[PDB]
Ligand binder design. Structure first.
Ligand SMILES: N[C@@H](CO)C(=O)NS(=O)(=O)OC[C@H]1O[C@@H](n2ccc(=O)[nH]c2=O)[C@H](O)[C@@H]1O
Ligand SMILES: N[C@@H](CO)C(=O)NS(=O)(=O)OC[C@H]1O[C@@H](n2ccc(=O)[nH]c2=O)[C@H](O)[C@@H]1O
Ligand code: NA
Ligand code: NA
Ligand code: NA
Ligand code: NA
Ligand code: NA
Ligand code: NA
Lengths: 456, 456
């Protein structure tokens, strides 16, 4: 599954999607292409269901005739009118019951052949529909700025700290002068481009950030979550876009798997096929993992890095996920304030939002030596978009419930707490002195009380 | 290069290798096969050097003749005695100068062809020699127990704590009752077999162990080392046996790379092509990485796990590596004594040692509910075996040093400090109560002062 079809089949729902597509500067016609694919698919299902019923009628009629010792019949030849009728889904059981045993057996095989053919048609139509659904964005929140370009379109909502201060050395220069980061040929000749070795104080800092970040979420009611770093192709497909396979994900062999780009992928996949009847309290996870990105100076943008993630699974009702989004961006803000890092928070414009996000806040920290705001955090409300793909249902789940006009799904949200390597770059720029890098106060107990890491 | 040929060319050295092969239940005839392949290889090189000098004689003679405006000559035909002479490495420079310009040009091409043919023979002999060298074990330490079967052949060196202690639930049962470990279909259907999810308190313990282990080694003079988790095929080949590519290493694609099975792999590979004139102080690295093993209940043996590694690069002189091996197993012992885990230390028998190890100590912790000693640590002295493969030289170069006749290489050792998931399994068995798992005292400051993680 990619998206639930229910909204597309409703006139009001289809218009809500079309409007969201226009507001995202995306194609509204994708909604119409999905409805048409679904109409063709529903036709194969109608015929399959009708023909499965007629196969059971054939079997029961043969059984009745064999019991009554009725002669098997003159021929197995099916009347062309009968063939035309089951191909059009109009063949009545009363007409099937007029056939002899020989014809009922032939018809049962003919109907089974039709079902096999229709299943192949339905598979091709599901593939077409699913490909179209991948280009459908989540329904935008009403507060999303309407713009195509990030540069002009994003809205700065909040700022913190001294965002105009300048510093001498950038993170690359500082990490070089510490003697604690090696990105030379000694590393790239063994591990490929953009690979690195961290040593000494920088490793102590990395661990101090992992542990401080995890404790920071534990204190706020998140459950630590350590995932597998591998996902199979099928499962990865449910939590990643097609474009992520070609540009971002490494393939692992030795049954093909993919390395995770963030703990958001295995945490969302962990809820696949789940059904929470009620979520009086939301599910809050503190994901901890290495992240691997194909990405198709220094350690600002690398293939391998640690990240502490906020992940929330909540009720889809009473706009609760919107309250969680505000709490999650606030947590990322509080975290950066605790490190004494200046920043701004931006509300991402409609044209720049990834398909799963109904709204996204980025926290961009100030890099005083680089002289720029740089993204450290992304916090998104994915509402029920990922839940439809992984099939994570919500609501009453009782015996006797029929094909419900409205299937409810959980809401899911994800947000960076700390992308470790990039935070270390930001810390190095903001805490540099002539002697080295001052360790932010809150991190000192997490790294043996060390107050500064010195230039070599 | 697999091994340096120098020890095989020495009669005493070759006898030392043959004896070590017999004492390891390996083939001593491999030594004689290598000597023979090297004898044929030296013949190709003698002939290559002779013909290279002869090519220069051709170039100089053609040069001198054209400067003296001498005519080309009557023929390009090479006298049969000239061809026989260069094919046997007996062609004299005086016999070459007697040839005309046309013959000298023909001879230079013929000698170039012979050099190309000799290079193909030399490469095939290098491949044979290297394939044989792969079945040559490191020279055994004289204290290694002589036996084939690890089950009965290892020698118990030391024991600590109550190694007969019994406990109620095993690590799998404990981790399940905690509600903090998931190895069910919810994980295996998304990440493959032997994959897992850790939650809550067990993640806090996982981080507490990583941080305590790193500080433990920092306090003992080790430099933290965070590596790339990928290595290219060429480089991985220098730090892994061919059996490891088949049975242990995952392949990564997106040049083809391999996931590291241990930080020992990238740390050793980091010293490739290096040369240390002296190591008055050794190089000590505290490796920190996730480890990935194909392995072709619970989290005792899984594909993905964290490990803190001890890695030492030292002088090959005065058996200094042997003092380091003692310090390294003592460091692992002191670590498990600080955690209060009972164990035994074993000296691994000759037949069970991997080819790189001259000697190996395993620390096998006592699992009181499982009722067994289980390997938590391996400490190996690889002497110069890995340094020959990665070309990590030591001391003076041969040329211009009358007293230097041997190519010296650094000594390398590696030893587990803490294999995090297996240590958590051990702590769970040893620290269980009716209410949960008591946190070892040393780890409490590393996990928010938590005294116990409670059953669900
Ligand atoms: N699961 C969600 C929320 O964390 C997610 O992954 N969003 S993200 O923006 O793709 O990634 C989350 C964060 O990861 C960091 N990052 C990215 C690439 C890189 O090379 N190094 C980094 O440090 C960036 O700071 C970014 O804001
Ligand atoms: N570099 C050296 C020394 O650390 C090395 O890797 N040796 S080892 O024995 O292969 O591995 C080192 C240690 O890794 C652990 N391990 C292994 C496999 C697994 O599935 N889970 C584990 O926890 C075992 O306890 C073992 O003693
Ligand atoms: Na810069
Ligand atoms: Na982002
Ligand atoms: Na005892
Ligand atoms: Na057991
Ligand atoms: Na071992
Ligand atoms: Na010499």
């Amino acid at each position: 599954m990619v998206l639930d079809i229910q909204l597309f089949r409703d006139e009001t729902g289809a218009n809500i999607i079309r409007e969201s597509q226009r507001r995202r500067f995306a194609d509204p016609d994708i909604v119409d292409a999905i409805i048409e694919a679904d109409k063709k698919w529903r036709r194969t299902q109608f015929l399959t269901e009708a023909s499965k019923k007629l196969i059971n009628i054939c079997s029961k009629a043969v059984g009745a005739k064999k019991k009554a010792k009725e002669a098997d019949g003159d021929t197995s030849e099916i009347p062309p009118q009968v063939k035309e009728a089951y191909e059009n889904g109009t063949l009545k059981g009363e007409q099937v019951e007029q056939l002899c045993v020989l014809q009922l057996k032939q018809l049962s095989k003919d109907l089974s052949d039709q079902v096999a053919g229709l299943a192949k048609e339905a598979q091709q139509l599901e593939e077409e529909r699913d490909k179209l659904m991948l280009n459908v964005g989540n329904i935008l929140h009403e507060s999303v700025p309407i713009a195509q370009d990030e540069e002009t379109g994003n809205t700065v909502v909040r700022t913190f700290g001294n965002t105009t201060k300048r510093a001498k050395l950038n993170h690359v220069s500082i990490m070089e002068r510490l003697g604690m980061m090696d990105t030379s040929k000694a590393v790239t000749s063994m591990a490929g481009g953009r690979s690195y070795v961290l040593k000494g104080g920088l490793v102590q800092l990395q661990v101090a950030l992992v542990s401080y970040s995890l404790d920071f979420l534990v204190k706020r009611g998140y459950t630590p979550f350590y995932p597998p770093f591998f996902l199979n192709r099928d499962v990865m497909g449910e939590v990643a876009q097609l474009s992520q396979f070609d540009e971002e994900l490494y393939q692992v062999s030795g049954d093909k798997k993919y390395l995770i780009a963030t703990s958001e992928m295995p945490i969302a996949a962990y809820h696949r096929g789940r059904w929470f009847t009620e979520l009086k309290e939301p599910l809050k996870y503190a994901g901890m993992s290495t992240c691997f990105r194909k990405e198709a100076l220094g350690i600002f943008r690398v293939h391998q890095f640690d990240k502490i993630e906020q992940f929330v699974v909540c009720s889809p009702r009473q706009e609760e996920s919107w309250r969680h989004l505000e709490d999650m961006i606030t947590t990322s803000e509080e975290f950066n304030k605790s490190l004494g890092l200046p920043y701004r928070v931006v509300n991402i414009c409609s044209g720049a939002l990834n398909n799963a996000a109904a709204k996204k806040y980025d926290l961009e920290a100030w890099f005083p030596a680089s002289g720029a705001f740089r993204e450290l955090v992304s916090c998104s409300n994915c509402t029920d978009y990922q839940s439809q793909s992984v099939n994570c249902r919500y609501g009453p789940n009782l015996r006797g419930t029929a094909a419900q006009n409205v299937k409810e799904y959980c809401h899911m949200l994800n947000g960076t707490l700390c992308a470790i390597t990039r935070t270390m770059c930001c810390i190095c720029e903001n805490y540099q002195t002539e002697e080295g890098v001052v360790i932010p106060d809150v991190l000192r107990p997490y790294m043996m009380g060390i107050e500064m890491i010195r230039f070599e």
